[PDB]
Design a protein around this ligand. Structure first.
Ligand SMILES: Nc1nc2c(ncn2[C@@H]2O[C@H](COP(=O)(O)OP(=O)(O)O)[C@@H](O)[C@H]2O)c(=O)[nH]1
Length: 406
């Protein structure tokens, strides 16, 4: 069922590798070879230079689930490889980098491509092939049950029963900027002509057909919706304030690496004066300390006050979630941070940072090449995170930093 494609500039050894791992043609599409301990299919993208590679990568982006991006290790990273990489930045689908005909000499060069760990291989006696296919197969679990066009922004609303999820959805769908369409679990619509899907609206409308006997199935259903979304809107009740179950689902969103917006509904019904909002914010920050990146919005599904602010926040959070940073700027940001604040020491050793690069999006993840990963303490990691945020934004999304040795 999962589909794999191999992509890269001509003459890097793609055909050799393809022929090795492919079995019989499903009659285009080939089944994986009998000896493999993985079950998947391959797609051929064969069939004028920059446009030729472009079309191959576009077939791959549209029809495959996981992409292998191949380069030639003996040539190193060429302008044409960098060109292919730039085309590939346009998908959210997983891309695994394979380095053919090889290793440690140019580690940064291959990491420069921005797809993370390079898997060395040889089409002769298949050395490295086990590690490469392992890396590819591990994405197989994250393949969507329900597939939408890449353009569509997928989000969900979560929160305890009666916080106003249904009311907010109905209020947001009634604005002049929205066009509702026309799976019966999701709701499709456009906002300023951009396509969006609200994940699992059926589960939000479950009541009205069914009595609530327990929350336990509703919560489990919410976690599935989170899994399918890029942006999660955590909705809190302004009247009754924060409660312990609010933490459970929001913590899950954070650990799942999702973009997050915090929404306070029923703001109309709150006993308010000049400082009630600011104190509510601080209370959210104190209860949800792992969500410092998430913006907080105050609105009323009832009076429609500030409803106009939700979609723009979902948009911004989604954008930041998907953002890919330029490497030279990234490195200047980190060198500037290290200048501001010297690195942690341990006996006589000092952390040294050689190079940093982004490795993935949704959420943005970075590797920093160091001295010794053990000298990179959690507090210093957070310091680096905040310097990256100051320079690039990243509001609405978590980010990941990993120290690695040469
Ligand atoms: N005062 C006030 N009440 C609201 C607001 N939004 C929803 N409610 C009420 O809260 C109750 C639960 O709303 P509902 O949308 O069914 O919550 P859900 O279970 O999260 O879908 C309903 O009686 C709504 O009228 C609001 O902004 N202000």
């Amino acid at each position: 069922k999962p589909v794999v494609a191999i992509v890269g500039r001509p003459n890097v050894g793609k055909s050799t590798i393809f022929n090795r791992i492919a079995g019989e043609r499903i009659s285009r599409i080939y089944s994986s070879a009998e000896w493999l301990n993985y079950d998947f299919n391959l797609i051929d993208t064969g069939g004028p230079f920059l446009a030729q590679i472009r079309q191959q990568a576009e077939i791959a982006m549209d029809e495959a689930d996981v992409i292998i991006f191949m380069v030639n290790g003996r040539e190193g990273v060429t302008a044409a490889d960098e060109e292919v990489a730039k085309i590939l930045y346009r998908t959210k689908k997983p891309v695994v980098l394979a380095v053919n005909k090889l290793m440690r000499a140019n580690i940064y060069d291959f990491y420069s491509l921005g797809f993370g760990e390079p898997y060395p291989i040889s089409g002769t006696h298949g050395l490295g092939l086990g590690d490469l296919l392992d890396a590819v197969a591990e994405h197989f679990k994250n393949i969507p049950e329900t597939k939408y066009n890449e353009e569509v922004i997928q989000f969900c609303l979560i929160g305890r029963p009666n916080v106003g999820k249904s009311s907010l959805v109905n209020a947001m769908l009634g604005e002049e900027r929205v066009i509702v369409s026309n799976d019966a679990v999701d709701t499709s619509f456009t906002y300023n002509q951009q396509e969006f899907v609200i994940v699992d609206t059926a589960g939000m409308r479950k009541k009205g057909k069914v009595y609530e006997t327990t929350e336990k199935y509703s919560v489990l259903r919410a976690l599935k919706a989170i899994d399918r979304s890029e942006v999660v809107a955590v909705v809190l009740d302004g009247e009754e304030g924060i409660i312990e179950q609010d933490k459970r689902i929001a913590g899950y969103a954070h650990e799942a690496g999702k973009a997050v917006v915090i929404v306070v509904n029923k703001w109309d019904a709150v006993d308010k004066d000049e400082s009630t909002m600011k104190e509510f914010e601080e209370n959210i920050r104190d209860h949800f300390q792992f969500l410092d990146y998430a913006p907080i919005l105050f609105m009323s599904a009832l009076t429609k006050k500030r409803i106009h602010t939700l979609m723009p926040a979902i948009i911004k959070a989604s954008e930041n979630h998907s953002l890919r940073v330029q490497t030279n700027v990234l490195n200047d940001v980190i060198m500037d941070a290290v200048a501001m604040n010297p690195t942690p020491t341990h006996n006589g050793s000092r952390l040294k940072i050689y190079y940093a690069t982004q490795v993935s999006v949704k959420p943005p993840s970075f590797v920093v090449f160091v001295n010794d990963p053990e000298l990179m303490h959690f507090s210093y990691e957070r310091f680096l995170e905040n310097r990256i945020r100051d320079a690039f934004g990243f509001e609405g999304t978590p980010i990941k930093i990993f120290a690695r040795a040469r």
